[PDB]
């Protein structure tokens, strides 16, 4: 049971940091790899990015790279932050896993394939509103 427990402040103001966690339990953390998802009411889903073993952060080009996504092993937590939060971000943030699936369609020797990042296990999500209130 990898219950991806998400816990954020729940009330934020514009141009600060949102701190939502993502717990790993009932199973190890270094064995597999985890990531983050988000979606908004009225709109569709919006993945935030991916953190892998090399810890280099792949970012969303449509969000202007104004987030701080990371991960720490000590307290078994996924550390996602959003610096400079715009008032448009009043929505819910999810958790998700990620199995790095290797899609073959050509020859491996020439780099004639690509990697599809499939996700299986998700979280529940906490909705945080951002405005002059905190």
């Amino acid at each position: 049971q990898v219950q991806l427990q998400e816990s954020g402040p729940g009330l934020v103001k514009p141009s600060e940091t949102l701190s939502v966690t993502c717990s790993v339990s009932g199973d190890s953390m270094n064995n597999y790899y985890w990531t983050w998802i988000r979606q908004s009411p009225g709109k569709g889903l919006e993945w935030i990015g991916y953190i892998s073993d090399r810890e280099s952060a792949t970012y969303n080009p449509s969000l202007n790279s104004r987030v701080v996504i990371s991960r720490d092993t000590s307290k078994n937590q996924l550390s996602l932050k959003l610096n400079s939060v715009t008032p448009a971000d009043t929505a819910v943030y999810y958790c998700a896993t990620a199995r790095r699936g290797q899609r073959i369609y050509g020859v491996v020797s020439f780099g004639e394939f690509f990697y599809y990042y499939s996700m299986d296990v998700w979280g529940k999500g906490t909705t945080v509103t951002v405005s002059s209130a905190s």
Binding site: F114, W122, K124, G125
Partner: protein
């Protein structure tokens, strides 16, 4: 969203909007309203464990048929939102999850 209507006890075909140019890898998702979603079929054929046979995938013939979600025998648990997520060879990294496909079944007991 595109509202769609179907009957009960009928095989359902679900196709997403943008076309499948190049070899494609479709993923399906079950966004039941309010709570967390779950996937139906990934890799265009591999249904994950815990998914009943009422949800069937679409094999690839390298062309022709679009991303179709075969659904035989909708029940009182299928009133939800269905999402078409696909990886082709022309969109490169298919960053986007694409548009939202809606269904609202009528004649539901």
């Amino acid at each position: 969203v595109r509202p769609l209507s179907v009957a009960l006890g009928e095989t359902a075909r679900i196709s997403c909007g943008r076309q499948a140019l190049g070899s494609r890898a479709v993923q399906w998702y079950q966004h039941r309203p309010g709570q967390a979603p779950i996937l139906l079929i990934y890799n265009n054929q591999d249904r994950p464990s815990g998914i009943p046979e009422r949800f069937s995938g679409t094999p690839d013939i390298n062309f022709g048929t679009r991303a179709t979600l075969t659904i035989s025998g909708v029940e009182a648990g299928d009133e939800a939102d269905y999402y078409c997520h696909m990886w082709d060879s022309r969109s490169g990294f298919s960053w986007s999850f694409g548009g939202a496909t809606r269904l609202t079944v009528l004649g539901q007991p």
